[PDB]
Amino acid sequence: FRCDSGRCIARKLECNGENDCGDNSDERDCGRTKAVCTRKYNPIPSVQLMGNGFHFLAGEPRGEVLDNSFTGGICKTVKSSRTSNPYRVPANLENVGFEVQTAEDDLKTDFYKDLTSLGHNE
Amino acid sequence: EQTYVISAPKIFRVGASENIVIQVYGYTEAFDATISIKSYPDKKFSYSSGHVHLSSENKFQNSAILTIQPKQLPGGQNPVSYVYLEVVSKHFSKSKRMPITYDNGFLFIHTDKPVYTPDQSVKVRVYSLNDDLKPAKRETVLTFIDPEGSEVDMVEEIDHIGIISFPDFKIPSNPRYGMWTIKAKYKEDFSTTGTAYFEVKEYVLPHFSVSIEPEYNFIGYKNFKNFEITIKARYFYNKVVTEADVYITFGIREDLKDDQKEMMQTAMQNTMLINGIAQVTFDSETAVKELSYYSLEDLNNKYLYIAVTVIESTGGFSEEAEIPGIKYVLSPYKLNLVATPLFLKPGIPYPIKVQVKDSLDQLVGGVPVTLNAQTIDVNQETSDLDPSKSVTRVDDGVASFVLNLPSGVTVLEFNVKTDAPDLPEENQAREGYRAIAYSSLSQSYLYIDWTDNHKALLVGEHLNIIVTPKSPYIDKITHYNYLILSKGKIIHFGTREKFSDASYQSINIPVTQNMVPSSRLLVYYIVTGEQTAELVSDSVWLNIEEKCGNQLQVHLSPDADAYSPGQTVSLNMATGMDSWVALAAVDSAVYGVQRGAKKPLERVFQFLEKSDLGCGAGGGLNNANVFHLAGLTFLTNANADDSQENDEPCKEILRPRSKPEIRSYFPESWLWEVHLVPRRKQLQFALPDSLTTWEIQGIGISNTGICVADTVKAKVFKDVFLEMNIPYSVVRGEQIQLKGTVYNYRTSGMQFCVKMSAVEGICTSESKCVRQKVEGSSSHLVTFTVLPLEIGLHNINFSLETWFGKEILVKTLRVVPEGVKRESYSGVTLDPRGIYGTISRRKEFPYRIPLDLVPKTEIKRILSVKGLLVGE
Amino acid sequence: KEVDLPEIEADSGCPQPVPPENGFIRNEKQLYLVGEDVEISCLTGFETVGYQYFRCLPDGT
Numbered sequence A: 001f002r003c004d005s006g007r008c009i010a011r012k013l014e015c016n017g018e019n020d021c022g023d024n025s026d027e028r029d030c031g032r033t034k035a036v037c038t039r040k041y042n043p044i045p046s047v048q049l050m051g052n053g054f055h056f057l058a059g060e061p062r063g064e065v066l067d068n069s070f071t072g073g074i075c076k077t078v079k080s081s082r083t084s085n086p087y088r089v090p091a092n093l094e095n096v097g098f099e100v101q102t103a104e105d106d107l108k109t110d111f112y113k114d115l116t117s118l119g120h121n122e
Numbered sequence B: 001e002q003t004y005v006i007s008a009p010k011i012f013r014v015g016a017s018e019n020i021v022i023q024v025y026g027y028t029e030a031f032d033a034t035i036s037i038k039s040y041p042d043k044k045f046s047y048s049s050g051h052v053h054l055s056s057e058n059k060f061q062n063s064a065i066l067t068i069q070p071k072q073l074p075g076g077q078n079p080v081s082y083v084y085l086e087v088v089s090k091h092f093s094k095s096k097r098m099p100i101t102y103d104n105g106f107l108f109i110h111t112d113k114p115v116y117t118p119d120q121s122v123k124v125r126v127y128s129l130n131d132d133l134k135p136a137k138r139e140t141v142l143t144f145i146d147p148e149g150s151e152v153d154m155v156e157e158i159d160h161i162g163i164i165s166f167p168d169f170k171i172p173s174n175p176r177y178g179m180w181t182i183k184a185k186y187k188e189d190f191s192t193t194g195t196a197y198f199e200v201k202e203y204v205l206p207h208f209s210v211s212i213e214p215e216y217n218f219i220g221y222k223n224f225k226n227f228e229i230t231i232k233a234r235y236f237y238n239k240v241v242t243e244a245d246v247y248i249t250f251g252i253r254e255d256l257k258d259d260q261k262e263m264m265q266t267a268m269q270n271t272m273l274i275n276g277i278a279q280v281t282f283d284s285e286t287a288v289k290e291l292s293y294y295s296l297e298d299l300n301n302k303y304l305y306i307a308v309t310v311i312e313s314t315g316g317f318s319e320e321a322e323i324p325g326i327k328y329v330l331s332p333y334k335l336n337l338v339a340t341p342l343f344l345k346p347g348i349p350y351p352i353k354v355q356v357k358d359s360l361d362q363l364v365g366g367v368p369v370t371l372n373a374q375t376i377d378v379n380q381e382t383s384d385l386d387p388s389k390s391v392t393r394v395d396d397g398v399a400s401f402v403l404n405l406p407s408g409v410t411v412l413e414f415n416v417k418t419d420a421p422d423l424p425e426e427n428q429a430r431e432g433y434r435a436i437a438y439s440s441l442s443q444s445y446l447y448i449d450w451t452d453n454h455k456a457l458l459v460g461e462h463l464n465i466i467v468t469p470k471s472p473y474i475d476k477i478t479h480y481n482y483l484i485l486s487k488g489k490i491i492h493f494g495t496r497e498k499f500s501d502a503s504y505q506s507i508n509i510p511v512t513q514n515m516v517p518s519s520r521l522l523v524y525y526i527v528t529g530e531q532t533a534e535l536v537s538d539s540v541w542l543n544i545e546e547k548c549g550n551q552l553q554v555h556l557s558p559d560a561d562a563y564s565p566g567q568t569v570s571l572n573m574a575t576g577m578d579s580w581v582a583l584a585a586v587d588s589a590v591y592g593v594q595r596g597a598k599k600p601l602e603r604v605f606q607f608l609e610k611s612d613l614g615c616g617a618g619g620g621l622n623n624a625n626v627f628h629l630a631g632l633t634f635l636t637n638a639n640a641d642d643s644q645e646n647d648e649p650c651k652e653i654l655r656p657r658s659k660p661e662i663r664s665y666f667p668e669s670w671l672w673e674v675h676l677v678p679r680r681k682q683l684q685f686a687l688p689d690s691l692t693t694w695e696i697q698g699i700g701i702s703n704t705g706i707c708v709a710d711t712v713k714a715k716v717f718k719d720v721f722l723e724m725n726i727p728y729s730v731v732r733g734e735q736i737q738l739k740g741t742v743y744n745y746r747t748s749g750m751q752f753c754v755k756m757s758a759v760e761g762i763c764t765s766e767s768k769c770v771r772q773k774v775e776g777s778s779s780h781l782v783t784f785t786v787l788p789l790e791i792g793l794h795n796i797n798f799s800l801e802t803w804f805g806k807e808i809l810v811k812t813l814r815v816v817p818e819g820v821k822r823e824s825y826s827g828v829t830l831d832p833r834g835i836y837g838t839i840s841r842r843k844e845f846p847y848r849i850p851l852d853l854v855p856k857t858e859i860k861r862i863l864s865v866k867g868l869l870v871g872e
Numbered sequence C: 001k002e003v004d005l006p007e008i009e010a011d012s013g014c015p016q017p018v019p020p021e022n023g024f025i026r027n028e029k030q031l032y033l034v035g036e037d038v039e040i041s042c043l044t045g046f047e048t049v050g051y052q053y054f055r056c057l058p059d060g061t
């Protein structure tokens, strides 16, 4: 295909009730739509911060580098425990997981003679 | 709001005076504006720039003729792919990256006639024109190529007026029979190409032409117990065949490139041609079964072969004629939209013109066509529109349809199926289509509507065209703005103010001779959405009348409708202005030797109108699409022009397709001269001793451009006469029987006497005068039996003695040697530089004679040398 | 790797032809245009006897 934005996408993703191009041109003119995902699922929260860039020397996250809303027409899904309805995995992501319990091990403390410690390991 | 527009050809052409329309809705405040064409990745070289001054003076619109000539990279070729349009002005600037072609103009290769015998000279010349349709004087290189795809000779001449006269091309010494090719190109840098073809065959001019007309081009359910075949023979001097004995055979065939076939015995023979005509009805059912076959359905996608032999009953001449084949098919018909742009406007009636064809690519009229339609809404709504019907016109092949779409529409899905009364429902073909709404950020649309199925406009008229702008968020349309293209250069441009009164209003635009072959017009208006102006448009394709700049009119002197076999006569040249003219005389019988057709002119209108960068009936899908599809690309302020999909090649269809008398001089071609015509000229010459129709075509090129005339027929004809059936060549050795008939057209009878004059090397029966008796308005088969001894030797006279007639025939029998024709060749590679490892400067090919040789024959040889050039 | 792609004939030039026993084609290509000649010469210790050329026919032959 060709999004008039320029980006060039796989035809399968055409007339499928999902903005795959970004500009929605891939669904600009469609009569019958082969909907990819038969049921409404949720967006994983902060999914975009796994698609942002990471500046080594600054140790600071920067501008969006991956589009993580792109879904590739595959309706791959993943079920949250402690949250009813399933979440929708994006196409860049091979895996997502939710298993998380807490214990004392998680609450720790350190002593610093001086601030020189923080530089050494990294 | 200030919105600006620039319009330029989609692609530039080298050496074309490329016109660039500039239109703006600026302040009254007049201003200067430079425009230029600069090189790629560096605006260093500026090949041309144009200082167009606009104002309320020119309703804010100008034209500029920029041009791009030979300033380039010639050696180790890297000829540039791209260039840069630029706008420099007080008020604004921008720039475009635009491609560049070296395709410039038209090369018309004019061979003297389309069929030759070996050892004829092929006369040839060229008509070359530039993108502006003027002379375009460039030295040109045609190159001869044999029917084995092998180059042969090559020759240049300079171009003095547009009528380049090359030296005659004698056909080689033992040449290759088939389809020769002449490829013409400019010695200069422009890419331009021309092709032409001639056949080389041993051929003899054929005395009468046998037509053979079948009832249809398909064979199917209706006509399978009967297929009507009319066969119409007549002479080339306009008098039909009285008595003739006919023989028809039929055969099965796989395809049209099929070299051979399987004959069918029991094939209707022996109908007698009577007075111009004969007829038969071919029962395919009863005949086909004598080979393997049993049903028509068995016989699908197979062709039927017809070959006829008409020998004159009373008139010594075999003639032969054949039909390649007629397809036997279930599916009798093909389908294709003729002048239908696949982009629709909502709240408008859509136009649909469909076309029906037979298996052999020609029209068929009187067939009914059902159109089923389905609409889907912006709403995602799905709706069934009401099925229509029409019947394919007979002059067109086109059935027309109109559906008025509910204005909320986006996508139209239409079916088109044929509904012919005799065909099984499943057999009838269908094609389906989708049409798409012109997208408007505006929600704003346009529909300019003009169509005549009557289909032709005449230079001089004034075009009246209806502009309906239904939908736009605001009708605060200030101005309607049009643009008229023709042969890829913008030629007209202008603006009409919106009538508060109209909603729809007229434009009157004068039809001019700049548009003669064809034209497009495009109309856009700016709707300033008070946040980003939108450009909104539509275009339409307009075939118009075929009128020359210099109409040549040719006339023969003695206005009599039949002519005399020796007589001198003057010819008339006519022109609207000083011109050149290039004459041709062709025996109208010689078109008869090849089933294929003469090709000056028909073509000349078409070739010339293939400089249009457009496609479709016009009318796009964006605003950008519209302008692009129309053969343009713009630079723009409100909506920019995006795409580079010029690449996928254009296809749509626009137009639906003493007191002795001595006869001696029988020239196949003559009048191969060119003349300077000061609007007037005349010239006398005695037309050759030969009973045929002379078909003499004159074509003239001038400042204005090219113009081919109506060909002049001129049948020359005698009352009582003799013509012999002489073979191309005869072999010395075996005795031959020479045929030929005397033709008595006089209302009373006569007693006559033929006698042959033999030359030193040719034999005859006795040695008188063998006085016979021909009835009023008939013929008498006369024959002589000769035997050739001296090879190659020519000249036989035939002398005719009659009541009120005395005729002597000057013919030229040709003779060949017995046995075989062995061919043997050798060669060398000349390699002075020992490239191959050994230096080569000489071979010696020794004369060597094998004693198996047929007596009294030369040994020939030919030296062909082909320089072997290589490399990029 | 070059060997593995052998795919288009639309072009209509003749494929590489077959040299005669003890010889070779002087002039390698995949496709030759119709009417091109290729010259046959011989391996070491053998020399050409006769017509040294094949011509490419529109035939493809």
Ligand SMILES: *[C@@H]1O[C@H](CO)[C@@H](O[C@@H]2O[C@H](CO)[C@@H](O)[C@H](O)[C@H]2NC(C)=O)[C@H](O)[C@H]1NC(C)=O
Pocket (backbone or CB within 6 Å): A095, A097, A098, A099, A100
């Ligand atoms: C993060 O992800 C990985 C899976 O990719 C988890 O690793 C699995 O942990 C379970 C623990 O029950 C094991 O049974 C699996 O064998 C592990 N698989 C792999 C491939 O290592 C890990 O537990 C996750 N961590 C958190 C905190 O959720």
Ligand SMILES: *[C@@H]1O[C@H](CO)[C@@H](O[C@@H]2O[C@H](CO)[C@@H](O)[C@H](O)[C@H]2NC(C)=O)[C@H](O)[C@H]1NC(C)=O
Pocket (backbone or CB within 6 Å): B662, B757, B758, B759, B795, B796, B797, B808, B810
């Ligand atoms: C056929 O007849 C023509 C004349 O009708 C002969 O040609 C003539 O030849 C003589 C010399 O023999 C010339 O003086 C004449 O001028 C020629 N006449 C013309 C009109 O060209 C020709 O020789 C005859 N051929 C035979 C075999 O008898």
Ligand SMILES: [Ca+2]
Pocket (backbone or CB within 6 Å): A013, A014, A015, A016, A017, A018, A019, A020, A021, A026, A027
């Ligand atoms: Ca989509």
Ligand code: NA
Pocket (backbone or CB within 6 Å): B449
């Ligand atoms: Na109308």
